[PDB]
Each structure stands twice: as C-alpha cells, then as structure tokens.
C-alpha cells in the first residue's frame, strides 16, 4: 500500500476561525485554479519509524527556510499544478513532504506562505496510521 497527500486549494485568509491541524468542512469559497505547488522531501527524516517524528519534530524552519529559500536540507520530489482547486499526490513513501507555492503565474493573487506536513500521519487517537493526509492551505490574494 502507499500514502497520499491531498491539498485543497483555497483563497483568502480565515475569517475569525481557529487554525485546524485536521480535517474540516470545506468552505468552498472561490478557489484558485492553475495554482502551482511542488513537493520537497526532507532528507535524514523518515516517517517510517517512531524515532522519525521525534527528529522531524525538532525541525526548525530555520533549516528548511532561512534566506527565504530552501537549502540542501530538502530533496526535489515532484512539481505539479493544482487544477480545479484540488491537487493529489500518490506513490508517497514514508517521510516528510513540504509544499511550496511557486511565484510563477498567480497575477491577481500574491504568493502565500508555504506549509509543511509529515506523511503518513498518525490517527487522531494515536492508534495506527492514516494512509491519506488532508490539507487545506489558503492563498493570499493581491490587495
């Protein structure tokens, strides 16, 4: 079996709502189509064993993001463009996936900050592991 990461493209910042690190009902507000996202795998980190989240949890954006750009601490995985406001990645081996929104395109919209998510993720109860990780990163529009 394999793991997969589903990224739901959304536009606009939360409206007084709290940050949720789990599945939530989709707002369904106008999404940004033709959005570019790319996955980068963090080396030395394997979500295959328990020790993996411990080391990974000690990760500092300072190491993956210091000069406003990624370092050698990341490995190129694949670049795909979200279409229809929804993107999905498959054939994912246990590790750490990092999503970066490319500046290219997005003329009426400004590039939002990137987000990081480990895969696979443990179940809400901590029992077993989930084969699919859901993410709802929002974009920041221009003006």
């Amino acid at each position: 079996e394999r793991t997969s990461i589903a990224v739901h493209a959304l536009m606009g910042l939360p409206t007084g709502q709290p940050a949720n690190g789990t599945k939530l009902d989709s707002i369904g507000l106008p999404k940004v189509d033709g959005m570019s996202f790319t996955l980068y795998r963090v080396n030395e980190i394997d979500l295959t064993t328990q020790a993996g989240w411990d080391a990974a949890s000690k990760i500092k954006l300072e190491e993956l993001y210091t000069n406003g750009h990624p370092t050698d601490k990341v490995t190129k995985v694949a670049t795909k463009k979200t279409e229809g406001g929804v993107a999905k990645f498959d054939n994912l081996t246990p590790a750490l996936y990092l999503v970066v929104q490319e500046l290219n395109g997005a003329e009426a919209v400004v590039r939002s900050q990137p987000f990081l998510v480990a895969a696979p993720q443990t179940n809400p109860t901590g029992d077993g592991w989930l084969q699919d990780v859901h993410v709802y990163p929002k974009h920041q529009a221009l003006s």
Binding site: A19, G21, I59, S112, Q113, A118, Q121, V135, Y136, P137
Partner: peptide, 10 residues
Amino acid sequence: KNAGFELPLT
C-alpha cells in the same frame, strides 16, 4: 496534538 508539523492554514 503530538503528531503533525505546521498546517495552521485551513
């Protein structure tokens, strides 16, 4: 929460 990384953006 324990498990997770940084996906505050919903």
